[PDB]
Design a protein around this nucleic acid. Structure first.
Ligand SMILES: [Mg+2]
Ligand SMILES: [Mg+2]
Ligand SMILES: [Mg+2]
Ligand SMILES: [Mg+2]
Ligand SMILES: [Mg+2]
Ligand SMILES: [Mg+2]
Ligand SMILES: [Mg+2]
Ligand SMILES: [Mg+2]
Ligand SMILES: [Mg+2]
Ligand SMILES: [Mg+2]
Ligand SMILES: [Mg+2]
Ligand SMILES: [Mg+2]
Ligand SMILES: [Mg+2]
Ligand SMILES: [Mg+2]
Ligand SMILES: [Mg+2]
Ligand SMILES: [Mg+2]
Ligand SMILES: [Mg+2]
Ligand SMILES: [Mg+2]
Ligand SMILES: [Mg+2]
Ligand SMILES: [Mg+2]
Ligand SMILES: [Mg+2]
Ligand SMILES: [Mg+2]
Ligand SMILES: [Mg+2]
Ligand SMILES: [Mg+2]
Ligand SMILES: [Mg+2]
Ligand SMILES: [Mg+2]
Ligand SMILES: [Mg+2]
Ligand SMILES: [Mg+2]
Ligand SMILES: [Mg+2]
Ligand SMILES: [Mg+2]
Ligand SMILES: [Mg+2]
Ligand SMILES: [Mg+2]
Ligand SMILES: [Mg+2]
Ligand SMILES: [Mg+2]
Ligand SMILES: [Mg+2]
Ligand SMILES: [Zn+2]
Lengths: 134, 122, 52, 50, 135, 86, 60, 105
RNA sequence: CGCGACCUCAGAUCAGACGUGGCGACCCGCUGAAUUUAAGCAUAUUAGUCAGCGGAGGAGAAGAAACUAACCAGGAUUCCCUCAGUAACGGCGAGUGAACAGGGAAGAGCCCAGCGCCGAAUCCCCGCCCCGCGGCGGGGCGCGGGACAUGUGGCGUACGGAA
RNA sequence: CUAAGGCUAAAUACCGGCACGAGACCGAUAGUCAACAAGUACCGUAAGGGAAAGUUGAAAAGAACUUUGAAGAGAGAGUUCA
RNA sequence: AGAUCUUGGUGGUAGUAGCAAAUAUUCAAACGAGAACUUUGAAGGCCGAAGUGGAGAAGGGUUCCAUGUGAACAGCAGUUGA
RNA sequence: CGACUCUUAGCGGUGGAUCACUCGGCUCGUGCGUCGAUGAAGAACGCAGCUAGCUGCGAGAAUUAAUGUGAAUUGCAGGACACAUUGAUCAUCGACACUUCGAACGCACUUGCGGCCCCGGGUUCCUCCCGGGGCUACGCCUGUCUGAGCGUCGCU
């Protein structure tokens, strides 16, 4: 279990940190698993969710294998919006339904130099850990 | 079509003041539009122009301050805003030289009877 | 805050209690009555080699 | 009164400016917990500090 | 001495505190003079003082002051101690020679009132109830 | 009449706003604040009102300079330096 | 009619209008509004027309 | 009010004692801090003895304790003189000295 | 009957520095009650406490014996355990009340004045140059100013010191 | 023992401050006065006194539309697991 | 279950006391869903220049002006309003 | 028959107890232990496109720069932002900036009024008007300059 005397296991402290986290660490909180193919290709497991990557929902009402592009990462409400994940409201207009990024899986990453760099950094750390633990 | 600090630092005083004046004139026009209704784009540009003014002014002030620091470097007496501002007590306390200089009696003691490294067998 | 939260016990009594607990741990009826599911343990004072 | 000092007039100006209702769009913000301006002052109900 | 500063001599209380005259200040006139010199020249440090004359109504002292920020004082070891922040208003904390004499400090059987640094320190130590963890 | 009729005669303010401490306790005729004692150099403060002390103690306001001091203490009050440029 | 800084007096208002609008002004009357703003009625010189000056300012 | 037989007791609790009560909840923390300071000091003086200088053999003063013997503050100058050690080199080589102690015997 | 030296004072928006006010849990110096207890109450108690005033620092204060002792002697200060609710104080009533020795935590010692010797050996400030900047120092130069024999510096301090 | 001069770290104290960790504690009349735009609203000339007030739902999906009424307010319908 | 207990809520009283100091209102019309009270016109009265008139000081602080609303407030009402 | 009253039950009101929850306290412990004339604490007033409070900030005003990060902020709108001819946001914070009172400092304040030295304009060097900048508190130390004394003297 936890042995570091400078990280707290207090429930109220952890909840306060989570709900008052600034956006640059809400980004880390709002991470999603990669698909099995992406986990094979890039030697990484998880990834913070991003504006223009394609995900599929694995929990809730919108479960399915249909792939949808993320269209908004609402970090204040800790949710993301996906293309066809929406519902009709009373007056006939459609509204996106926000779902937690931990309940999706990323099937294609929006790739630029920064995402690539973070990918190799995570892969190198995992490889160093594997070599230390072998 | 924003302005950055990096390319402003290259420029000199005349065109920096010219650009500050242009920004102030455009801000006055935007305030006129704001009071006469205007458009949402012109309302939103007010913050852009205000921050651009802040950028130009901070570049001007930083250049002037570092020029003054260069001018007063190596001088006995410096302006108070150029002197360090650690803390009032930190400025009152003794400096490194007079903090560690000793008396002749003290250093004769240290020379004659220095502390020795020793071990004691059980 | 000065409720006297702590109690001091005699060292001899503390050693006595340790001895009693150790002696009770070697009786299968008492360890079973603590609900420890020893029905296939080969020998209750279970001793293993130093390789562990 | 009609005769007043600049400090008093400025104080009354600030009180006037902050005695107004809340904007409508405030109640649509995330986690608002604000229904109305609870610091509204009426000139006849409660009197100012000065 | 120190006349009690009460209106019309009325000290409303038990008769043991009715005293107005024949009362004496706890600190000496030399200490009072040192305190006055330091309070006027608050930018200086009182070192000591000495007696130079007296009348039936006045006592005259001379107080030695040190400017702690002068370079002659500041560059000299064995004098740098007076320049430390802890050594300001010694005459007001009772740390000069004259002000120290009223505190009852000293070694031995005559000075048991101040074992621990001062009367208040000794009183706190002797009147504090030590409640250990294990009673 | 010592009550309702006499309450009609109060039209002259004893106290006004104090330029220190901003409280409506500046006695005009005595020219002194009953809360802070403004013409006096030192702040009026008494140990028989801890509630009054904690109403106006340090930290009840802005602490514009003390916030910066508390932040700057964590790095040894460093000055004249900048982060290594990129 | 302008809304000016509360610390600006009549001379400063006159010179500011003269500089940044290139018009000559006859006089300046100044009040402080109940909301705390300062309002300046700047009467222009007879040879300057307030209507088209307001046009080129953009407040017609 | 006394009640039958008992001891005449005199509690010293007439003096507002609850303002000055010293609890000891920081006793284990104090012990840990003292141990850490001891270990840091022992590391700092690396080959030198951790407890410090040698102390002289010293008989206890009064008639209750003169049969016992303990450790003093420092070796007397007469002891150092007849042992051939300088009183300014003894403290350098780790010998505690006590200039105000005399040797009666 | 003017010009100098010194002394004692004064002015300056003089050159360069410093103090003021805040917080105040802990600490230092003063001032300082009454409720209360005594089954009343005045000494006593509450209490050297509350309130009041001043002054600090990360701790402060204390501190290297004009000490304890009476022993076969200990050996600066501070803190803990104990001494000890004891010696003692007290309408000897109610009540109050330490210290030494002992065991530990920590442990560290020193500097002047004075007596003297040494051609004031001493110190501050202002210019000039070089090495630095980062808390403003180092080195040198000035028939450059001032402090200072009404006493600066080196040796030296009761454990003795000097030649 | 050597007063009437001076300095001196450690062990010690810490209901204010900065930043942490924890609890056989309290659980919205409790726990700080203050879980919330709280030393706020408000009261007093002033010194000063000083509250009340947590909870839709997983997600606003916060009831489109029709209908009576001038409206508040209703009847249907609709969202929701509710 | 009690403490003229603390805080909060709710009854009977009870659709009760009461909405009675300073002479007084009426007719028609307009707006309006709605008029004893609003507006206009007509009539009858009152203040009667030491005023129920016209203006200031202190105090208030936006109550001033226009437009709109009809939830609450104006102890009946309101189409009116500080 | 009905009304009314009482008891009990169902349903509906009124009210907010109970229960469950908890970004709050309370207590203990730890490590640091840092304010201010280079203008503190405190106060006032301002600052957002739509902003009253809280919060943040100071006329560069819900923030500039720099560094780290790396695509958002979000109630609505707007517009940035090739994320490499460099970057949204957030965090950090060492550069810069920091209105008026306040120890508060030219004098004074329930108002206001000066003096000195420069600079710019109207003047067309001379000092009148306007604007801008910098000074102008008390105490006190060292030094400096100017002095005072039928204080002690020297020379004349
Ligand atoms: Mg010497
Ligand atoms: Mg009224
Ligand atoms: Mg008595
Ligand atoms: Mg009366
Ligand atoms: Mg009066
Ligand atoms: Mg006017
Ligand atoms: Mg000067
Ligand atoms: Mg009694
Ligand atoms: Mg009694
Ligand atoms: Mg009595
Ligand atoms: Mg007190
Ligand atoms: Mg002070
Ligand atoms: Mg000390
Ligand atoms: Mg001392
Ligand atoms: Mg000695
Ligand atoms: Mg006993
Ligand atoms: Mg006593
Ligand atoms: Mg030890
Ligand atoms: Mg000498
Ligand atoms: Mg509560
Ligand atoms: Mg509840
Ligand atoms: Mg209604
Ligand atoms: Mg249900
Ligand atoms: Mg009950
Ligand atoms: Mg009962
Ligand atoms: Mg009736
Ligand atoms: Mg009636
Ligand atoms: Mg008549
Ligand atoms: Mg009239
Ligand atoms: Mg009106
Ligand atoms: Mg009504
Ligand atoms: Mg019900
Ligand atoms: Mg930035
Ligand atoms: Mg006047
Ligand atoms: Mg003479
Ligand atoms: Zn005040």
């Amino acid at each position: 279990m936890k042995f570091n005397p400078f990280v707290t296991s207090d429930r109220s402290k952890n909840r306060k940190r989570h709900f008052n986290a600034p956006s640059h660490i809400r980004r880390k909180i709002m991470s999603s698993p990669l698909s099995k193919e992406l986990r094979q290709k890039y030697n990484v497991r998880s990834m913070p969710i991003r504006k223009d990557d394609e995900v599929q929902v694995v929990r809730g009402h919108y479960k399915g294998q249909q792939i949808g592009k993320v269209v908004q990462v609402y970090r204040k409400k800790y949710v993301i919006y996906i293309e066809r994940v929406q519902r009709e409201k009373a007056n006939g207009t459609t509204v996106h339904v926000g779902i937690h990024p931990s309940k999706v899986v990323i099937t294609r990453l929006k790739l630029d130099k920064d995402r690539k760099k973070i990918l190799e950094r995570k892969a190198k750390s995992r490889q160093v850990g594997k070599e230390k633990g072998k | 079509a924003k302005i950055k600090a990096r390319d402003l630092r290259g420029k000199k005083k005349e065109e920096l003041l010219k650009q500050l004046d242009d920004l102030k004139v455009e801000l006055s026009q935007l305030r006129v539009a704001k009071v006469t209704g205007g458009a949402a784009s012109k309302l939103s540009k007010i913050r852009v122009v205000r921050k651009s003014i802040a950028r130009v002014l901070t570049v001007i002030n930083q250049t002037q301050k570092e020029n003054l620091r260069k001018f007063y470097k190596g001088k006995k007496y410096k302006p108070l805003d150029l002197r360090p501002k650690k803390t009032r007590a930190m400025r009152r306390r003794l400096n490194k030289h007079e903090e560690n200089l000793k008396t002749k009696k003290q250093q004769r003691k240290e020379r004659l009877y220095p502390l020795r490294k020793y071990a004691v067998k059980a | 805050t000065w409720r006297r939260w702590h109690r001091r016990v005699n060292t001899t009594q503390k050693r006595y209690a340790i001895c009693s607990a150790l002696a009770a741990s070697a009786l299968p009826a008492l360890v079973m009555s603590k609900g420890h599911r020893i029905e296939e343990v080969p020998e209750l004072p279970l001793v293993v080699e130093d390789k562990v | 009164s009609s005769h007043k000092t600049f400090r008093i007039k400025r104080f009354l100006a600030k009180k006037q400016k902050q005695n107004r209702p809340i904007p409508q769009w405030i109640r649509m913000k995330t986690g608002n917990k604000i229904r109305y301006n609870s610091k509204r002052r009426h000139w006849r109900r409660t009197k100012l500090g000065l | 001495g120190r006349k009690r500063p009460v209106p019309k001599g009325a000290t409303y209380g038990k008769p043991v505190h009715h005293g107005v005259n024949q009362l004496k200040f706890a600190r000496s006139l030399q200490s009072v003079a040192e305190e006055r010199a330091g309070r006027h020249c608050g930018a200086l440090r009182v070192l000591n003082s000495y007696w130079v004359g007296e009348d039936s109504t006045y006592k005259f002292f001379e107080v030695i002051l040190i400017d702690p920020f002068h370079k002659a004082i500041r560059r000299n070891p064995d004098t740098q101690w007076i320049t430390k922040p802890v050594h300001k208003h010694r005459e007001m904390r009772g740390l000069t020679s004259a002000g120290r004499k009223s505190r009852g400090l000293g070694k031995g059987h005559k000075f048991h009132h101040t074992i621990g640094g001062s009367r208040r320190a000794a009183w706190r130590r002797r009147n504090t109830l030590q409640l250990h963890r294990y009673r | 009449t010592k009550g309702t009729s006499s309450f009609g005669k109060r039209r002259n303010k004893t106290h006004t706003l104090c330029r220190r401490c901003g409280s409506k306790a500046y006695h005009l005729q005595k020219s002194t604040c009953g809360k802070c004692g403004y013409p006096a150099k030192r702040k009026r403060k008494y140990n028989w009102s801890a509630k009054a002390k904690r109403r106006n103690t340090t930290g009840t306001g802005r602490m514009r300079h003390l916030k910066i001091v508390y932040r700057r203490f964590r790095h040894g009050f460093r000055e004249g330096t900048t982060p290594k440029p990129k | 009619v302008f809304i000016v800084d509360v610390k600006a007096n009549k001379h400063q208002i006159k010179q500011a209008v003269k500089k940044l609008y290139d018009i000559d002004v006859a006089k300046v009357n100044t009040l402080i509004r109940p909301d705390g703003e300062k309002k300046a009625y700047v009467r222009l010189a007879p040879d300057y027309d307030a209507l088209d000056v307001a046009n080129k300012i953009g407040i017609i | 009010a006394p009640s039958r037989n008992g001891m005449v007791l005199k509690p010293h609790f007439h003096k507002d004692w609850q303002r000055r009560v010293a609890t000891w909840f920081n006793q284990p923390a104090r012990k840990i801090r003292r141990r850490k300071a001891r270990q840091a000091k022992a590391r700092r003086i690396a080959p030198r003895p951790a407890s410090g200088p040698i102390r002289p053999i010293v008989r206890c003063p009064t008639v209750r304790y003169h049969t016992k013997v303990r450790a003093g503050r420092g070796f007397s100058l007469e002891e150092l003189r007849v042992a051939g050690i300088h009183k300014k080199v003894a403290r350098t080589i780790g010998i505690s000295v006590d200039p105000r102690r005399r040797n009666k015997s």
